[PDB]
Amino acid sequence: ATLTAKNLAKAYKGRRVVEDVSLTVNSGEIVGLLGPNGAGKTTTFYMVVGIVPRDAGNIIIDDDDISLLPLHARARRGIGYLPQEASIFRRLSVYDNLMAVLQIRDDLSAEQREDRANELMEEFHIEHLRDSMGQSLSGGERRRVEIARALAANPKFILLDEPFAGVDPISVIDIKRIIEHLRDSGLGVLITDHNVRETLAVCERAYIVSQGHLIAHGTPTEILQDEHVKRVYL
Ligand SMILES: Nc1ncnc2c1ncn2[C@@H]1O[C@H](COP(=O)(O)OP(=O)(O)O)[C@@H](O)[C@H]1O
Numbered sequence: 001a002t003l004t005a006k007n008l009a010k011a012y013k014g015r016r017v018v019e020d021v022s023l024t025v026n027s028g029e030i031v032g033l034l035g036p037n038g039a040g041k042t043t044t045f046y047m048v049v050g051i052v053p054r055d056a057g058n059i060i061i062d063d064d065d066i067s068l069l070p071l072h073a074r075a076r077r078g079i080g081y082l083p084q085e086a087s088i089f090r091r092l093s094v095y096d097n098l099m100a101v102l103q104i105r106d107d108l109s110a111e112q113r114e115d116r117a118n119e120l121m122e123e124f125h126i127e128h129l130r131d132s133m134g135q136s137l138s139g140g141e142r143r144r145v146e147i148a149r150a151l152a153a154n155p156k157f158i159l160l161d162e163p164f165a166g167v168d169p170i171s172v173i174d175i176k177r178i179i180e181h182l183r184d185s186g187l188g189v190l191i192t193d194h195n196v197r198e199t200l201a202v203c204e205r206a207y208i209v210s211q212g213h214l215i216a217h218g219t220p221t222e223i224l225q226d227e228h229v230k231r232v233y234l
């Protein structure tokens, strides 16, 4: 499957924070959208997911333009999303967090939803935290639960908005491996970060954004040697 954004634009009070942004992510690859804080990464994700109105542009899955589809319909079509900010239910256990999201799985019986929660806990290395309250978890643990929550909806594409934010250096290793596993499983992964080198290493290719504009695309080695990229990190 293919998810494409074309000519996305968004302004706040006239300030153009995303301008003429186009990108593609296909099943089975990890694609980066990388650039400094404020570059427009989250805003771009918002327009793809359906969280904020776009000022311009199109969202396309395969042959179908889904620009007019509400958030819930785009999700059904395969768009999954991990917010940058905390999204876990802090008062609820890991298990209850997962079961809450799994209630949207009308294709599964109640027992099958329970089965899926157990599978997800094992896959994300959080099954030992089944009954732990979200509030009690470390940043890294919470992030694993949040990614599991995103996956519970069975998406084709997963937009990870800074999955390493608030995660200790140690926990980052496992999350990277989980993300690599997602790609291996056939998910299309679009991942944001301000730490270019760290996240680039796990990308097959990446777009670099600066002040609302795409300035470069390529493999990690191409990006690290691109003068247009160097030019904004002087
Ligand atoms: N609701 C809003 N009103 C005004 N400005 C906003 C709003 N949301 C985001 N912005 C601005 O848009 C710019 C891009 O934000 P964002 O897309 O979150 O950047 P990034 O995720 O790349 O750090 C930021 O400078 C931010 O101040």
Ligand SMILES: [Mg+2]
Pocket (backbone or CB within 6 Å): 041, 042, 043, 084, 161
């Ligand atoms: Mg952001």
